[PDB]
PDB file of all heavy atoms in Angstrom:
ATOM      1  N   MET A   1     194.614 -66.687 -15.885  1.00 40.60           N
ATOM      2  CA  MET A   1     196.042 -66.752 -15.476  1.00 40.60           C
ATOM      3  C   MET A   1     196.935 -67.026 -16.678  1.00 40.60           C
ATOM      4  O   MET A   1     196.486 -66.983 -17.824  1.00 40.60           O
ATOM      5  CB  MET A   1     196.248 -67.856 -14.439  1.00 40.60           C
ATOM      6  CG  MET A   1     195.215 -67.849 -13.326  1.00 40.60           C
ATOM      7  SD  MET A   1     195.323 -66.383 -12.285  1.00 40.60           S
ATOM      8  CE  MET A   1     194.032 -66.726 -11.089  1.00 40.60           C
ATOM      9  N   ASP A   2     198.204 -67.310 -16.404  1.00 41.41           N
ATOM     10  CA  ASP A   2     199.167 -67.601 -17.457  1.00 41.41           C
ATOM     11  C   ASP A   2     200.258 -68.534 -16.942  1.00 41.41           C
ATOM     12  O   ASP A   2     201.350 -68.096 -16.581  1.00 41.41           O
ATOM     13  CB  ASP A   2     199.792 -66.307 -17.992  1.00 41.41           C
ATOM     14  CG  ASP A   2     198.759 -65.356 -18.563  1.00 41.41           C
ATOM     15  OD1 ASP A   2     198.424 -65.491 -19.761  1.00 41.41           O
ATOM     16  OD2 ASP A   2     198.284 -64.474 -17.815  1.00 41.41           O
ATOM     17  N   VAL A   3     199.947 -69.824 -16.912  1.00 39.47           N
ATOM     18  CA  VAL A   3     200.885 -70.834 -16.440  1.00 39.47           C
ATOM     19  C   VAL A   3     200.598 -72.182 -17.095  1.00 39.47           C
ATOM     20  O   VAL A   3     201.446 -73.075 -17.111  1.00 39.47           O
ATOM     21  CB  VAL A   3     200.818 -70.968 -14.901  1.00 39.47           C
ATOM     22  CG1 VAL A   3     199.374 -71.098 -14.439  1.00 39.47           C
ATOM     23  CG2 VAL A   3     201.649 -72.145 -14.413  1.00 39.47           C
ATOM     24  N   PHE A   4     199.398 -72.311 -17.654  1.00 40.67           N
ATOM     25  CA  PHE A   4     198.995 -73.549 -18.319  1.00 40.67           C
ATOM     26  C   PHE A   4     199.874 -73.802 -19.537  1.00 40.67           C
ATOM     27  O   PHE A   4     200.540 -74.832 -19.637  1.00 40.67           O
ATOM     28  CB  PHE A   4     197.524 -73.487 -18.754  1.00 40.67           C
ATOM     29  CG  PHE A   4     196.731 -72.403 -18.081  1.00 40.67           C
ATOM     30  CD1 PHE A   4     196.729 -71.115 -18.592  1.00 40.67           C
ATOM     31  CD2 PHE A   4     195.993 -72.671 -16.941  1.00 40.67           C
ATOM     32  CE1 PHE A   4     196.005 -70.114 -17.979  1.00 40.67           C
ATOM     33  CE2 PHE A   4     195.265 -71.672 -16.322  1.00 40.67           C
ATOM     34  CZ  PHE A   4     195.272 -70.391 -16.840  1.00 40.67           C
ATOM     35  N   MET A   5     199.867 -72.846 -20.461  1.00 41.44           N
ATOM     36  CA  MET A   5     200.664 -72.943 -21.676  1.00 41.44           C
ATOM     37  C   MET A   5     202.122 -72.593 -21.394  1.00 41.44           C
ATOM     38  O   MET A   5     202.411 -71.752 -20.543  1.00 41.44           O
ATOM     39  CB  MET A   5     200.096 -72.016 -22.750  1.00 41.44           C
ATOM     40  CG  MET A   5     198.739 -72.455 -23.278  1.00 41.44           C
ATOM     41  SD  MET A   5     198.787 -74.090 -24.035  1.00 41.44           S
ATOM     42  CE  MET A   5     197.062 -74.314 -24.468  1.00 41.44           C
ATOM     43  N   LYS A   6     203.032 -73.241 -22.113  1.00 40.21           N
ATOM     44  CA  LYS A   6     204.461 -73.005 -21.935  1.00 40.21           C
ATOM     45  C   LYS A   6     204.913 -71.744 -22.664  1.00 40.21           C
ATOM     46  O   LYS A   6     206.100 -71.419 -22.675  1.00 40.21           O
ATOM     47  CB  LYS A   6     205.265 -74.209 -22.432  1.00 40.21           C
ATOM     48  CG  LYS A   6     204.970 -75.499 -21.680  1.00 40.21           C
ATOM     49  CD  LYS A   6     205.307 -75.383 -20.200  1.00 40.21           C
ATOM     50  CE  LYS A   6     206.796 -75.157 -19.976  1.00 40.21           C
ATOM     51  NZ  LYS A   6     207.130 -75.044 -18.529  1.00 40.21           N
ATOM     52  N   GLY A   7     203.965 -71.042 -23.276  1.00 40.27           N
ATOM     53  CA  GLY A   7     204.296 -69.825 -23.994  1.00 40.27           C
ATOM     54  C   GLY A   7     203.076 -68.970 -24.277  1.00 40.27           C
ATOM     55  O   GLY A   7     202.387 -69.175 -25.277  1.00 40.27           O
ATOM     56  N   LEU A   8     202.810 -68.009 -23.397  1.00 41.41           N
ATOM     57  CA  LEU A   8     201.661 -67.127 -23.565  1.00 41.41           C
ATOM     58  C   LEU A   8     201.891 -65.783 -22.879  1.00 41.41           C
ATOM     59  O   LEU A   8     201.550 -64.736 -23.431  1.00 41.41           O
ATOM     60  CB  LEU A   8     200.387 -67.789 -23.023  1.00 41.41           C
ATOM     61  CG  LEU A   8     200.285 -67.889 -21.498  1.00 41.41           C
ATOM     62  CD1 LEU A   8     198.914 -68.411 -21.095  1.00 41.41           C
ATOM     63  CD2 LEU A   8     201.378 -68.787 -20.937  1.00 41.41           C
ATOM     64  N   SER A   9     202.472 -65.812 -21.681  1.00 43.93           N
ATOM     65  CA  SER A   9     202.732 -64.584 -20.935  1.00 43.93           C
ATOM     66  C   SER A   9     203.562 -64.848 -19.680  1.00 43.93           C
ATOM     67  O   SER A   9     204.398 -64.027 -19.302  1.00 43.93           O
ATOM     68  CB  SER A   9     201.415 -63.910 -20.546  1.00 43.93           C
ATOM     69  OG  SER A   9     201.645 -62.725 -19.808  1.00 43.93           O
ATOM     70  N   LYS A  10     203.335 -65.996 -19.043  1.00 45.78           N
ATOM     71  CA  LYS A  10     204.058 -66.350 -17.824  1.00 45.78           C
ATOM     72  C   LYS A  10     204.047 -65.202 -16.818  1.00 45.78           C
ATOM     73  O   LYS A  10     205.029 -64.473 -16.682  1.00 45.78           O
ATOM     74  CB  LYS A  10     205.500 -66.744 -18.155  1.00 45.78           C
ATOM     75  CG  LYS A  10     205.599 -67.998 -19.003  1.00 45.78           C
ATOM     76  CD  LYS A  10     205.040 -69.207 -18.274  1.00 45.78           C
ATOM     77  CE  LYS A  10     204.724 -70.329 -19.242  1.00 45.78           C
ATOM     78  NZ  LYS A  10     205.942 -70.794 -19.962  1.00 45.78           N
ATOM     79  N   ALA A  11     202.928 -65.049 -16.116  1.00 48.81           N
ATOM     80  CA  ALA A  11     202.788 -63.993 -15.120  1.00 48.81           C
ATOM     81  C   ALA A  11     202.927 -64.550 -13.707  1.00 48.81           C
ATOM     82  O   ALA A  11     202.978 -63.795 -12.735  1.00 48.81           O
ATOM     83  CB  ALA A  11     201.449 -63.287 -15.281  1.00 48.81           C
ATOM     84  N   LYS A  12     202.990 -65.873 -13.601  1.00 49.15           N
ATOM     85  CA  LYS A  12     203.125 -66.533 -12.306  1.00 49.15           C
ATOM     86  C   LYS A  12     204.556 -66.423 -11.787  1.00 49.15           C
ATOM     87  O   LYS A  12     205.378 -67.298 -12.131  1.00 49.15           O
ATOM     88  CB  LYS A  12     202.718 -68.005 -12.410  1.00 49.15           C
ATOM     89  CG  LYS A  12     201.212 -68.245 -12.363  1.00 49.15           C
ATOM     90  CD  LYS A  12     200.495 -67.626 -13.552  1.00 49.15           C
ATOM     91  CE  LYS A  12     199.911 -66.268 -13.192  1.00 49.15           C
ATOM     92  NZ  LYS A  12     199.036 -65.732 -14.269  1.00 49.15           N
TER      93      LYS A  12
END
């Protein structure tokens, strides 16, 4: 997924 990091992809 992409929500853990504050900057990676943000797909949530």
Side-chain angles (χ1 to χ4, degrees):
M1 314 294 182
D2 300 273
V3 49
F4 343 85
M5 292 300 178
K6 298 299 296 180
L8 72 173
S9 179
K10 296 297 162 61
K12 279 64 263 188

